[PDB]
Design a protein around this motif. Structure first.
Motif, mmCIF file in Angstrom:
data_model
loop_
_atom_site.group_PDB
_atom_site.id
_atom_site.type_symbol
_atom_site.label_atom_id
_atom_site.label_comp_id
_atom_site.label_asym_id
_atom_site.label_seq_id
_atom_site.Cartn_x
_atom_site.Cartn_y
_atom_site.Cartn_z
ATOM 1 N N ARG A 166 -38.550 -47.698 -49.060
ATOM 2 C CA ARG A 166 -39.963 -47.363 -49.048
ATOM 3 C C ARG A 166 -40.219 -46.284 -50.089
ATOM 4 O O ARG A 166 -39.326 -45.498 -50.416
ATOM 5 C CB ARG A 166 -40.402 -46.908 -47.651
ATOM 6 N N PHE A 167 -41.444 -46.258 -50.601
ATOM 7 C CA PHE A 167 -41.820 -45.274 -51.607
ATOM 8 C C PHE A 167 -41.822 -43.874 -51.007
ATOM 9 O O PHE A 167 -42.109 -43.676 -49.824
ATOM 10 C CB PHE A 167 -43.219 -45.553 -52.174
ATOM 11 N N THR A 168 -41.517 -42.896 -51.852
ATOM 12 C CA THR A 168 -41.778 -41.502 -51.519
ATOM 13 C C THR A 168 -43.271 -41.286 -51.282
ATOM 14 O O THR A 168 -44.120 -41.922 -51.912
ATOM 15 C CB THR A 168 -41.307 -40.612 -52.667
ATOM 16 N N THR A 169 -43.594 -40.363 -50.388
ATOM 17 C CA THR A 169 -44.993 -40.035 -50.154
ATOM 18 C C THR A 169 -45.448 -38.864 -51.017
ATOM 19 O O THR A 169 -44.651 -38.054 -51.497
ATOM 20 C CB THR A 169 -45.246 -39.701 -48.679
ATOM 21 N N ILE A 170 -46.766 -38.792 -51.216
ATOM 22 C CA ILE A 170 -47.344 -37.647 -51.904
ATOM 23 C C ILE A 170 -46.978 -36.359 -51.177
ATOM 24 O O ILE A 170 -46.655 -35.344 -51.809
ATOM 25 C CB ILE A 170 -48.870 -37.822 -52.026
ATOM 26 N N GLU A 171 -46.996 -36.392 -49.840
ATOM 27 C CA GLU A 171 -46.674 -35.209 -49.045
ATOM 28 C C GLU A 171 -45.255 -34.731 -49.317
ATOM 29 O O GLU A 171 -45.011 -33.523 -49.408
ATOM 30 C CB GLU A 171 -46.853 -35.511 -47.555
ATOM 31 N N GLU A 172 -44.310 -35.664 -49.454
ATOM 32 C CA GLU A 172 -42.923 -35.277 -49.700
ATOM 33 C C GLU A 172 -42.774 -34.587 -51.049
ATOM 34 O O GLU A 172 -42.082 -33.565 -51.153
ATOM 35 C CB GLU A 172 -42.007 -36.500 -49.598
ATOM 36 N N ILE A 173 -43.424 -35.108 -52.088
ATOM 37 C CA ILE A 173 -43.403 -34.409 -53.371
ATOM 38 C C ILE A 173 -44.035 -33.031 -53.229
ATOM 39 O O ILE A 173 -43.489 -32.028 -53.697
ATOM 40 C CB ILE A 173 -44.106 -35.231 -54.466
ATOM 41 N N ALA A 174 -45.200 -32.963 -52.586
ATOM 42 C CA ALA A 174 -45.916 -31.693 -52.488
ATOM 43 C C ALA A 174 -45.119 -30.654 -51.711
ATOM 44 O O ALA A 174 -45.123 -29.467 -52.070
ATOM 45 C CB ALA A 174 -47.282 -31.915 -51.839
ATOM 46 N N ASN A 175 -44.444 -31.075 -50.639
ATOM 47 C CA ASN A 175 -43.678 -30.130 -49.832
ATOM 48 C C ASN A 175 -42.618 -29.441 -50.682
ATOM 49 O O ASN A 175 -42.507 -28.213 -50.680
ATOM 50 C CB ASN A 175 -43.026 -30.840 -48.639
ATOM 51 N N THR A 176 -41.848 -30.224 -51.441
ATOM 52 C CA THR A 176 -40.822 -29.632 -52.292
ATOM 53 C C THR A 176 -41.443 -28.835 -53.441
ATOM 54 O O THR A 176 -40.917 -27.778 -53.811
ATOM 55 C CB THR A 176 -39.883 -30.727 -52.808
ATOM 56 N N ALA A 177 -42.579 -29.295 -53.980
ATOM 57 C CA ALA A 177 -43.246 -28.568 -55.059
ATOM 58 C C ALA A 177 -43.685 -27.183 -54.606
ATOM 59 O O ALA A 177 -43.410 -26.179 -55.278
ATOM 60 C CB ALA A 177 -44.448 -29.365 -55.574
ATOM 61 N N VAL A 178 -44.367 -27.110 -53.463
ATOM 62 C CA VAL A 178 -44.925 -25.834 -53.039
ATOM 63 C C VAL A 178 -43.823 -24.894 -52.558
ATOM 64 O O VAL A 178 -43.857 -23.689 -52.844
ATOM 65 C CB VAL A 178 -46.013 -26.080 -51.978
ATOM 66 N N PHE A 179 -42.811 -25.419 -51.857
ATOM 67 C CA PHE A 179 -41.664 -24.581 -51.518
ATOM 68 C C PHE A 179 -41.025 -23.997 -52.777
ATOM 69 O O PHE A 179 -40.720 -22.800 -52.836
ATOM 70 C CB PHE A 179 -40.619 -25.362 -50.712
ATOM 71 N N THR A 180 -40.827 -24.831 -53.800
ATOM 72 C CA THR A 180 -40.167 -24.375 -55.020
ATOM 73 C C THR A 180 -40.999 -23.336 -55.767
ATOM 74 O O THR A 180 -40.446 -22.380 -56.331
ATOM 75 C CB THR A 180 -39.863 -25.577 -55.911
ATOM 76 N N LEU A 181 -42.328 -23.508 -55.790
ATOM 77 C CA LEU A 181 -43.193 -22.527 -56.442
ATOM 78 C C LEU A 181 -43.157 -21.186 -55.728
ATOM 79 O O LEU A 181 -43.304 -20.134 -56.364
ATOM 80 C CB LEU A 181 -44.640 -23.033 -56.479
#
Lengths: 259, 260
Positions: free
Chosen positions: A217-232
């Motif tokens: 299944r495709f990655t979700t937008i939420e999954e990208i965003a979660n790692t993005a905001v944690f990393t920032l």
């Protein structure tokens, strides 16, 4: 988990739809102030972002216009007092294959996909250095793996991995972190419309999705965003120079894997 | 950020001190239930973990005893109803150089540092599969970069990166994520003790830390723990097979980088 980003300003290019919009909403819901640099902003997304962050702003911008970027980044800093973070995300896979694409059109693609990562970062850097903040480059699996008919996008995404490593070197002394996220297959409204071009949309999705080890299944937008905001956030305060793959195993697991 | 780990059980080997303890504390602070597998547990650390989670448990264990591992993992699952996650973290860099270390002593090092990652994961796997949970292997920069006088540790850490990729393949179909964190230089009381053995501890620290691009300073336990617990959590639900480097730039940035 307190990400400690309350009232911190993050400019997100291409932040009105898709992955960028997911990052914008999560940034706001965690107390940050998202500032969207896009060509247009859907009215429903403007309404939701305003609900999540009373200080959120949308700046209509042509990211091919360097002088407009200089003017608008300065206006952001004046309005908010500064800038903590930048997410470079604007662009699309334009599937420009080398054998039938001129060098001139490669450069036009770079105008759309590549050069503004440099211009935006250049203009934000004085402010991000002052706040000892973060730069996040959204790239793509395609810059690592190739694809086969998209020379312009693949090379732009790899170039941005190079910027990520180079700027991480340049600004580590300043306590500015620079990272990248390489998504693989991410379900977005634009992807869904593309799948609807196909005679059997669910079949085409399953054809792509079966190559994704984690769940087919495709990655979700939420999954990208979660790692993005944690990393920032300051909770990732010793993470720099990283190319991060929240991708279901797409890049790293045995290509032959199946059920 | 709601990590959605309330009441989820995570076993942490070597979780009584250092990086493991930092992961345990943060897991508990975020609502999870940490279960520590180690040879001993400091009284003050037991007190702090109980303050954070009334259901936290410490199990004294010889990680070289595979049958005791089997029995104690079963005890955890019976007591708590299951196991969501496993952090494999027990072990030390024992600086066993190939030129003066027998193969027998290499294997004894593997008993201390390597084999229990396999045994723990084997015994936890039925429970973690049921909960569609997470396995996190704590490794080391040394398994990627080498060091030069630590063949046993370097190969054990690299072996565990192999386990990470292999188990990610094996259990992706089960929606079980398997990842690793490769710290570089992390300040711990054990590290501080090692530095205090030098005539000039401050200069020895600065000699090491000058090679760390981000701040010329060691990574903190909290920095490792934050990335560990985020990665374990359902918020990293498409992250598998990853070797993660929260390391100040140690592995990836130009070796020549300096502040000149």
């Amino acid at each position: 988990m307190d990400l400690k980003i309350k009232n911190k300003v993050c400019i997100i290019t291409g932040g009105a739809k898709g992955i960028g919009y997911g990052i914008a909403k999560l940034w706001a819901s965690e107390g940050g102030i998202p500032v969207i640099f896009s060509r247009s902003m859907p009215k429903e997304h403007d309404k939701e972002l305003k609900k999540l962050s009373s200080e959120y702003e949308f700046y209509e911008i042509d990211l091919k216009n360097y002088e407009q970027i200089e003017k608008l980044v300065k206006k952001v800093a004046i309005k908010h007092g500064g800038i903590y973070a930048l997410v470079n995300n604007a662009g699309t896979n334009d599937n420009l294959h080398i054998e039938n694409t001129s060098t001139q059109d490669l450069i036009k693609s770079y105008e759309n996909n590549l050069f503004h990562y440099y211009t935006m970062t250049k203009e934000c850097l004085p402010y991000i250095k002052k706040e000892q903040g973060s730069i996040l480059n959204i790239v793509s699996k395609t810059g690592i793996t190739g694809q086969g008919r998209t020379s312009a996008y693949a090379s732009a995404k790899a170039a941005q991995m190079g910027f990520t490593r180079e700027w991480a070197c340049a600004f580590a002394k300043d306590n500015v972190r620079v990272n990248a996220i390489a998504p693989a297959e991410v379900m977005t409204p634009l992807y869904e419309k593309w799948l609807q071009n196909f005679p059997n949309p669910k079949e085409q999705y399953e054809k792509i999705a079966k190559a994704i080890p984690l769940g087919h299944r495709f990655t979700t937008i939420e999954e990208i965003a979660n790692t993005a905001v944690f990393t920032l956030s300051p909770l990732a305060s010793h993470t720099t120079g990283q190319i991060l793959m929240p991708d279901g195993g797409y890049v790293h697991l045995d290509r032959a894997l199946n059920w």
